[PDB]
Symmetry: C4
Subunit: 225 residues, 4 copies
């Protein structure tokens, strides 16, 4: 025999939850001001516990009235909600307290799934990645090749930018965004090894011919259907 | 009984007004040269008063011959004109005189509405925002989440960029435009907290995957109809 | 009675001219090396005179066999060629010799019109400006408004960037390209007048919402037909 | 009489080769850590020789069972593979050893052709260049003209940026990407020769009106068919 499955889908419930979130998006933006932080310390503690408990019972009521161990877990969205709330209860203890606050901010991130207009949008934004699934592998192979070539070439001439396979993977990401790729990344080096203009000029051409052909691929694909 | 509603829509009136504006766009660009400013001081005063009065009577003649208290106020454009001119008469006094000059420059902005070719264009440019009304909320939620996370993480390590919820909202806007996001914003910080490359690299990827999907959304939408 | 109009349109003539240009594109790129410049001085003088004369007779033969004072001047392209060559003969004298060399380089620019594949392309690229003829006026009005507002606001706080109506028109062009608009242009100023983040943030949003709507306008228009 | 042409196209062969490559993409990324490099020196030597030999016999088996001296060489892809492997055997000697390592990294680049999903993609990405074959010539002519004009104009005022026809060809490439084109490239110069704002402002407008019309050309072309 069923039960109160007719109120969790009521319109006087979504608005309650969004009001709660928006209040939590404010109580967590406010507590970044040390002045008002210490002045109302041990109040944020309580109100955080309250909001956490309300959210916990909230997902609970959204679980019982949704085909128990059947469909509630068949969706990714429900898993996202339950994951955050459970993560709230998990880390609550004498630990690296800082990782507890980021979870509160992510609670405000949950406002994406309780606004049916946004949930559908982010679904559309996520189900376009499988389309550009090959260009991304081709972009990763070239990122890797250049990250190895740059490391074994500019290791003892600029250890800040090309020091290891990771620092030189970061330098290669600053350059695809064309951020100081020449004034800072490539001018000092091109003074030591003069044939190095070939590395950066060939990378900026290839790495930008692939990016613009990913962008065009999405334009064509989305317009197609 | 009607009156001279047949001259405000005459073509020998729009050209008069545009001539007046273009003259005011010149008399206000010229007065930014202190040399010629002081040398012809107390002349700009008079000519400003003249232009203001002509503009005032101008909107008046555009009001009486346009269904009195009926349609003249039903449009946004007419409200824009009347608002500027009234703002001219409002602030004229012994006050922060500098806020009076900006109103003159905005008088030249009014040239958008008296050129029927431009008015229609800006109407089309404004009535495309409701289309991208969801992507903007999704972009604002992520701006806010990252502005709070960055503030409560990089507060005592770079107070210039992430000092409060607002300074760190400005830093996060410089980074979406990819302006010195790594050379200046993220290199000094990544030296203090080494795991911070995750903050900026994840933000530049997410915040740019949303922007390019807003741009594509507009391309698809406008091409659609 | 007609004459040799059947050789200027011969295919053994375009190739001669392109060979000449490509040789002039080399003789003018080579003379920028002072070493080989002085070492073969007074040779470049002669060969320049030769090439100039050949080009002059070349347009002459392209003039006589093309409906004398009828259609030869009805086209813009022919005017472009004749203008450059005449400009070559005009400035040749005891003058600011430097303005003579730029004319040689522009002779190599003439290679656009003698390659029928390029001439058609640049025609298509030029006859799309009348399409975006309104967005450009709307972009110019906003450039001007902000150039005046910035000048009468940031004149005595950063005379390098906003000194007059022109220096502040240049600063406003560096910012639409998002080049150091915050690290260099807006950070020093935002320290003097704190409410100035409104100027640059509002300009970067408006000036980029118009540019992307010009780009989209061209995409839609060109795809349309 | 034919032979074992039925195993090189077996699906238990492509996976073997990709496993080998992915292992070589790891053995070459790992050897950029000097710590683990010297500690396991003279082991990388052996394993490199092994992988090289396996790859050599691998292309050999892909050659014999593919119409001997007929079609194996009619394709560009097969030439690419054989070229890399032969280049591996070629340079192996008492020479500039550094050019030997880059060949290993390029062996991992070969993973593009043995993944039928990628090979087709890169074919599509390469057969779109003939489409934009005219815009590229028009872009090269303007790059060259400006590279000569800038060199013969800003030679003795900024020898770092415009020193010769090549250094000024590099400066002109940093500017089309809008990287520090004003803060670094054009501000110091505009202080010496004041009319030089014309060079950079006219170049950034022309060189960006051509790039955006190349991008649009590809959008239109790819959407067309
Ligand atoms: C279908 C084809 C797919 C093509 C993809 C190719 C993928 C091929 C994958 C290749 C794998 C790369 C080789 C891994 C080498 C790590 C081993 C190592 O040396 O660790 C070092 C530590 O240093 C570290 O801290 C580890 C850092 C991890 C490197 C991350 C690079 C991942 C590249 C991903 C590229 C993705 C693309 C990038 C853009 C997204 C240890 O050495 P040590 O410093 O001397 O310290 C002493 C040892 N100790 C620590 C035990 C005491
Ligand atoms: C559908 C879901 C929507 C999601 C949207 C989520 C929106 C949720 C909204 C969240 C609201 C954010 C919390 C506001 C906290 C202000 C209170 C405060 O502490 O003031 C401080 C002053 O400091 C100031 O000067 C006030 C500055 C206003 C902050 C502007 C951030 C707005 C974020 C908008 C984000 C938009 C996105 C950004 C990109 C566009 C006072 O503290 P004090 O300094 O110690 O001074 C002593 C007090 N005294 C001054 C009285 C003497
Ligand atoms: C349909 C609606 C259209 C809307 C468009 C609005 C256009 C409205 C047009 C407005 C015109 C702007 C006012 C001109 C003022 C110049 C007078 C002056 O003071 O000269 C000064 C010299 O300084 C100079 O060297 C002159 C520099 C010319 C300014 C170029 C700005 C053009 C703006 C174009 C904007 C285009 C957009 C920008 C983006 C493309 C003289 O003063 P002085 O220094 O003290 O020297 C002593 C005098 N002496 C030199 C004689 C001895
Ligand atoms: C259809 C129409 C097509 C239009 C295209 C137009 C193409 C027209 C082509 C024009 C060719 C350009 C002229 C070449 C001049 C080199 C001669 C020289 O002086 O060498 C100097 C060395 O300096 C060097 O090291 C050589 C560097 C090569 C210059 C590369 C520019 C290529 C431009 C490509 C532009 C492509 C576009 C750019 C963007 C991709 C020698 O002089 P020196 O220093 O005093 O040393 C003493 C001599 N010594 C060394 C023997 C001892
Ligand atoms: C990868 C693509 C290449 C393109 C080829 C183009 C032509 C190839 C041009 C030149 C090739 C040969 C150069 C001769 C000298 C080489 C060695 C050298 O010494 O370097 C010298 C110059 O070298 C440069 O500065 C490179 C010039 C930049 C070319 C950028 C082209 C942008 C393409 C635009 C794309 C748009 C169009 C799209 C069309 C694709 C510098 O060293 P140095 O002078 O000896 O000084 C001493 C060392 N010191 C610095 C420490 C003091
Ligand atoms: C968010 C997405 C991640 C992507 C994962 C990719 C693989 C993940 C790779 C590495 C992951 C693990 C790194 C091992 C070390 C971590 C901790 C650390 O010490 O940092 C170290 C290095 O760390 C880096 O520099 C990060 C490398 C930049 C990766 C950028 C990938 C760009 C994606 C391209 C997108 C295009 C393709 C699109 C495909 C999506 C730095 O610290 P340190 O060495 O100890 O030095 C001491 C501290 N000190 C600096 C103060 C002196
Ligand atoms: C134009 C659009 C506005 C947007 C409104 C957004 C919310 C409005 C937020 C705040 C509004 C009110 C701010 C309170 C303080 C104002 C006065 C002040 O003192 O400034 C202070 C902070 O001020 C800032 O730093 C501005 C924050 C940048 C907002 C950028 C939003 C990016 C939009 C993203 C677009 C993507 C989404 C698209 C959606 C459109 C700085 O001064 P101070 O702290 O007193 O320090 C002393 C002075 N000193 C610096 C010299 C030492
Ligand atoms: C190529 C296109 C041009 C556009 C024309 C626009 C109007 C033309 C405007 C002015 C033209 C005439 C200027 C008068 C002075 C010239 C000589 C001079 O002295 O320079 C002076 C100022 O000069 C500038 O700063 C130039 C202003 C930048 C205009 C950028 C327009 C951006 C177009 C936006 C595109 C978007 C819209 C698209 C529409 C296309 C500087 O020298 P000085 O003051 O004597 O100082 C002493 C020297 N010192 C510096 C070493 C100390
Ligand atoms: Na940029
Ligand atoms: Na930059």
């Amino acid at each position: 025999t069923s039960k109160m499955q007719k109120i969790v889908n009521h319109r006087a419930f979504t608005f309650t939850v969004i009001a709660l979130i928006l209040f939590n998006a404010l109580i967590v933006g406010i507590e970044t001001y040390p002045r008002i932080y210490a002045d109302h310390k041990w109040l944020f503690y309580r109100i955080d516990l309250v909001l956490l408990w309300i959210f916990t019972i909230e997902i609970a009521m959204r679980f019982l009235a949704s085909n128990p161990k059947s469909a509630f877990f068949r969706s990714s969205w429900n898993w996202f909600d339950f994951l955050i709330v459970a993560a709230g209860h998990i880390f609550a203890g004498a630990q690296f307290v800082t990782v507890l606050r980021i979870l509160r901010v992510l609670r405000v991130l949950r406002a994406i799934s309780v606004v049916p207009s946004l949930r559908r949008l982010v679904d559309a934004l996520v189900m376009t990645i499988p389309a550009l699934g090959n260009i991304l592998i081709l972009m990763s192979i070239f990122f890797y090749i250049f990250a190895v070539i740059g490391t074994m070439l500019f290791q003892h001439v600029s250890p800040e930018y090309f020091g290891n396979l990771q620092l030189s993977l970061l330098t290669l990401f600053q350059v695809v965004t064309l951020e100081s790729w020449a004034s800072g990344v490539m001018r000092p080096i091109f003074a030591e090894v003069p044939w190095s203009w070939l590395y950066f000029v060939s990378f900026v051409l290839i790495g930008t011919f692939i990016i613009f052909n990913l962008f065009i691929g999405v334009i064509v694909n989305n317009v197609e259907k």
